[PDB]
Paper text:
Tetraspanins are eukaryotic membrane proteins that contribute to a variety of signaling processes by organizing partner-receptor molecules in the plasma membrane. Among the 33 human tetraspanins, [name] (also known as Tspan29) is an extensively studied tetraspanin that is expressed in a wide variety of tissues and is also highly abundant on the membranes of extracellular vesicles. We first present crystal structures of the isolated EC2 domain of [name] in the absence and presence of anti-[name] nanobodies [name] and 4E8, revealing the flexibility of the D-loop region of [name].
Our group has previously reported the generation of several nanobodies that bind to the extracellular region of [name]. We selected nanobodies [name] and 4E8, which differ in amino-acid composition in complementarity-determining regions (CDRs) 2 and 3, for further characterization. [name] and 4E8 bind to purified, full-length [name] as well as to endogenous [name] expressed on HeLa cells with apparent binding affinities in the nanomolar range. To determine the nanobody-binding epitopes on [name], we solved crystal structures of the soluble EC2 of [name] (CD9EC2) in complex with [name] at 2.7-Å resolution and 4E8 at 1.4-Å resolution, as well as the structure of [name] alone at 1.7-Å resolution.
Numbering used by the authors: 1 to 102, 106 to 121
Write the structure that this text describes.
Amino acid sequence: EVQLVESGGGLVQAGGSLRLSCAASGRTFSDYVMGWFRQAPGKERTFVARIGWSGDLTYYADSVKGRFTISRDNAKNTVYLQMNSLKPEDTAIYYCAADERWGKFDYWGQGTQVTVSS
């Protein structure tokens, strides 16, 4: 099975930025669509962004499109989420996810906290 390990969470001031990363291992990384989800403490886990196998096709939730950028490096088995212009409402636990097909993902990371101070 594929293992996903997120990195890069932290505390940032409103208007700032963070880059999350997620390293996949155990199977050929280029066989998987990679996605990011987030769960705010009082809401259910919601979709953030996903990227196609080759890194060309990307899709973003309305609430983050234009501020967040998803990318991948298939030689490093890593997917990235560059989060710019952060808002307090971006505060959440962010989860990496993987699936061979393009809300259901077979594999999930353990989550990393992102806190945006007002």
